[PDB]
Design a protein around this ligand. Structure first.
Ligand SMILES: *[C@@H]1O[C@H](CO)[C@@H](O[C@@H]2O[C@H](CO)[C@@H](O)[C@H](O)[C@H]2NC(C)=O)[C@H](O)[C@H]1NC(C)=O
Ligand SMILES: *[C@@H]1O[C@H](CO)[C@@H](O[C@@H]2O[C@H](CO)[C@@H](O)[C@H](O)[C@H]2NC(C)=O)[C@H](O)[C@H]1NC(C)=O
Ligand SMILES: O=C(O)[C@@H]1Cc2c([nH]c3ccccc23)CN1
Ligand SMILES: O=C(O)[C@@H]1Cc2c([nH]c3ccccc23)CN1
Ligand SMILES: *[C@@H]1O[C@H](CO)[C@@H](O)[C@H](O)[C@H]1NC(C)=O
Ligand SMILES: *[C@@H]1O[C@H](CO)[C@@H](O)[C@H](O)[C@H]1NC(C)=O
Ligand SMILES: *[C@@H]1O[C@H](CO)[C@@H](O)[C@H](O)[C@H]1NC(C)=O
Ligand SMILES: *[C@@H]1O[C@H](CO)[C@@H](O)[C@H](O)[C@H]1NC(C)=O
Ligand SMILES: *[C@@H]1O[C@H](CO)[C@@H](O)[C@H](O)[C@H]1NC(C)=O
Ligand SMILES: [Ca+2]
Ligand SMILES: [Ca+2]
Ligand SMILES: [Ca+2]
Ligand SMILES: [Ca+2]
Ligand SMILES: [Ca+2]
Ligand SMILES: [Ca+2]
Lengths: 516, 122, 61
């Protein structure tokens, strides 16, 4: 399958490099080149590309006693921008940190990549996923649910996030009914089992840590069986996916609530996008297939070459916000700013031994990694970009809802709130419930408790084998009273007092004697 | 630190190879060699060893638009015995299954290595 | 026996208290989540472990 969003990200990287080349202030008299390959969301292709990257660092490899030979035409990669998947990023990071080649990702958000005892050279322009799990827990607690389900992808991205959500939820007295694992290559039996598990539960809310390509089979099967009335909490990976936000799935995945990254501004980017042409793009070899898939031609009718990009509606230009593309832009500019900081080193202020400075004409990868570890620069919009001791860049979240389009009939992503990761714990979530349309049409918050709350005059009772959230209430006995809702036990009245007929309160006893 | 148990395991592999070579029934007229490296329970060391293993297939890589050649007498490993840790085995399995080189582990027991979509030759 | 289990808030189901059954109900066995309201013409022991047939009262010869 062809991904136009990925080609847009590649174009964003190329645009950033060209803009830096045009700028005289950044890296005077120095030109940046690039070598870009396709991973296809697969570890094998990314590993072949990484081998091509490190073909020149492998010359002085101690593991071989003999001497290897590589042609001088092979260049030396100084830094890498990639990749999207966390497993792919881990596989690439192993080889890259073997040779201390810095790697700056734009979409990988697994917490496992924060461990620096394994991933020596790894940096990110996307925030870690602890805050996203905490925010999902905060949302669930805010809307007063306690009985939910969980789905996750069987990879380095879904599992840590689902574990963090599990612990945060059990901290907040939230009970999880089921927990299943799905993959892009799950057999029909596995999908059927997960769908059956979803059916057998009574929990409306379901939390999913997955991506579009991995969630697609499950969504397809659920739509095939018409399992409606479910509330989906999406993570940033698939909250704005074009594979799940398809209108004929709406009756299943309408009213979905999800997370999005803060967008950014790249002036002149759309103009660069619209100038793509298979023949003019000689450096960019991915333009040919992009054109063929855009206009359904083969350069099946042939390609005249005079077609207009705007004639076809694709994610290449049919977009509103730039979030991951801004991450790619920031990655390229961070590498460029590290190189610039190398280029302007004062003789007695270097980061190296005895305050020595590097030479930009013969700069090395580990020096650029050192300068990236101590980077501090200002964005185009005017914000400061630094990485922590683990190479992370923390940022806000926007909470969005999946609505319907009255005109086109497509799916709209309205903004219903925000999660401020900088505020104190407990004062970070904000939601305008007046805009949320549950299931896409409803205006009342759905009910997702295991059992109904029980009113005054009763007390909870254990149902054997079921969690704390599930209980059966028994009426209070004579003499005791219950003046609270959802009480663990009936309180007892003081002396000279006796229970009402309702046992909500208790009155004073009467006194009987022969009176005048 | 020094691991005597690991040295015993290495000796077991060498003993098995030598007993195969001495026997006339299993693989007559064919001799088995070996190239055995130390991992120090770390991914980096094992990855260097695996690069040594697959240098020939690096010569046979397809991504590089320009050819690269190494020493001819560098042996091509048929199969790999190892490794102990599961993360080490995962990384080594990625690199080896890139080239369809069988890898038989002796102490890696994680379920994540039961995926034949990601680990083809494990 | 004689006492039923009670829910402790903010703790799992494995952690519970237990309280004596009301007069009129009993708990014959342990690990009891409820006290049985045992049938007509029967009341409870002083220890609420079983049921005793009610005494019939009338003027006797
Ligand atoms: C994350 O979001 C919060 C709230 O949306 C931002 O805090 C606001 O910052 C602006 C200035 O940029 C102030 O005018 C508002 O009063 C702030 N709102 C508060 C404190 O509730 C915060 O700056 C964002 N973080 C970023 C952009 O990094
Ligand atoms: C579902 O269960 C939750 C328990 O977590 C209920 O939330 C409670 O709501 C009452 C409302 O008065 C609050 O006083 C409690 O503090 C809440 N408990 C919490 C936040 O742990 C929720 O009300 C239940 N659902 C319904 C419909 O009652
Ligand atoms: O770590 C990962 O695999 C996910 C992948 C991912 C994220 N956001 C995305 C948007 C589009 C496509 C893919 C993604 C978050 N990090
Ligand atoms: O997969 C793993 O990590 C473990 C490592 C391991 C196992 N048994 C051992 C005995 C000695 C030393 C290490 C091990 C079981 N598989
Ligand atoms: C769902 O419930 C039915 C009815 O008890 C049962 O037969 C079936 O095995 C259950 N399936 C799953 C996946 O729990
Ligand atoms: C699926 O369910 C929706 C809502 O209940 C209904 O409008 C639609 O007709 C159903 N479609 C099929 C094929 O059952
Ligand atoms: C980064 O630079 C800004 C100046 O724009 C400064 O205010 C800030 O304190 C610096 N941060 C660090 C961590 O050095
Ligand atoms: C007891 O409950 C009944 C039924 O709702 C109600 O009419 C009566 O007022 C209650 N008695 C109180 C609250 O004292
Ligand atoms: C009631 O149970 C108690 C145990 O706590 C026992 O000592 C007592 O004899 C019992 N009374 C009966 C069986 O009448
Ligand atoms: Ca990728
Ligand atoms: Ca997508
Ligand atoms: Ca059970
Ligand atoms: Ca032999
Ligand atoms: Ca090992
Ligand atoms: Ca607790």
């Amino acid at each position: 399958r062809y991904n136009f969003r990925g080609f847009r990200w590649l174009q964003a990287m190329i645009f950033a490099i060209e803009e830096i080349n045009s700028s005289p202030a950044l890296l005077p008299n120095l030109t940046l080149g690039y070598r870009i390959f396709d991973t296809c969301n697969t570890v094998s292709k990314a590993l072949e590309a990484t081998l091509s990257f490190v073909a020149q660092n492998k010359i002085d490899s101690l593991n071989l006693d003999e001497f290897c030979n590589c042609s001088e035409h092979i260049p030396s990669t100084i830094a890498v921008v990639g990749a999207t998947g966390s497993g792919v990023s881990t596989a690439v990071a192993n080889l890259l940190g073997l040779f201390y080649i810095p790697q700056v990702s734009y979409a990988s958000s697994s917490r496992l990549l924060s461990n620096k005892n394994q991933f020596k050279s790894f940096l990110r322009t996307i925030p870690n996923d602890e805050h996203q799990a905490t925010a999902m827990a905060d949302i669930i607690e805010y809307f007063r649910w306690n009985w939910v389900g969980t789905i996750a992808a069987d990879d380095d991205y879904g599992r840590p996030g689902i574990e963090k959500f599990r612990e945060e939820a059990e901290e907040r007295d939230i009970c999880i009914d089921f927990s299943e694992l799905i993959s892009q290559y799950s057999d029909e039996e596995e999908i059927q089992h997960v769908v059956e598990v979803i059916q057998n539960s009574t929990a409306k809310v379901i939390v999913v840590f997955s991506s579009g390509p991995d969630l697609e089979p499950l969504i397809k099967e659920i739509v095939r069986r018409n399992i409606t009335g479910k509330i989906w909490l999406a993570s940033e990976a698939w909250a704005s996916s074009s594979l799940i936000a398809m209108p004929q799935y709406f009756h299943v995945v309408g009213g979905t609530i999800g997370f999005a990254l803060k967008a950014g501004q790249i002036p002149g980017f759309r103009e660069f996008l619209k100038k793509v042409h298979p023949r003019k793009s000689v450096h960019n070899g991915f333009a040919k297939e992009f054109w063929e898939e855009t206009f359904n031609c083969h350069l099946r009718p042939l390609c005249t070459g005079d077609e207009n990009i705007s004639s076809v509606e694709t994610p290449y230009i049919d977009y509103t916000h730039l979030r991951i593309s801004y991450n790619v832009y920031l990655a390229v500019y961070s590498i460029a700013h590290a190189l610039q900081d190398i280029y302007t080193c004062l003789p007695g202020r270097g980061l190296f031994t005895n305050g020595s400075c590097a030479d930009i004409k013969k700069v090395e990868a580990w020096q650029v990694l050192k300068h990236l570890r101590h980077l501090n620069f200002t964005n185009n919009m005017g914000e400061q970009v630094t990485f922590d001791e683990c190479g992370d860049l923390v940022g806000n979240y926007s909470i969005i809802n999946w609505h319907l389009s009255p005109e086109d009939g497509s799916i709209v992503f309205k903004e219903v709130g925000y999660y401020n990761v900088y505020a104190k714990k407990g004062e970070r979530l904000f939601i305008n419930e007046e805009k949320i349309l549950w299931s896409g049409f409803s205006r009342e918050v759905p009910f997702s408790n295991c059992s109904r709350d029980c009113l005054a005059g009763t007390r909870k009772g254990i149902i054997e084998g079921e969690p704390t959230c599930c209980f059966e209430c028994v009426e209070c006995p004579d003499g005791e009273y219950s003046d609270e809702t959802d009480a663990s036990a009936c309180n007892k009245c003081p002396d000279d007092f006796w229970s009402n007929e309702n046992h909500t309160s208790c009155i004073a006893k009467e006194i009987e004697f022969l009176s005048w």
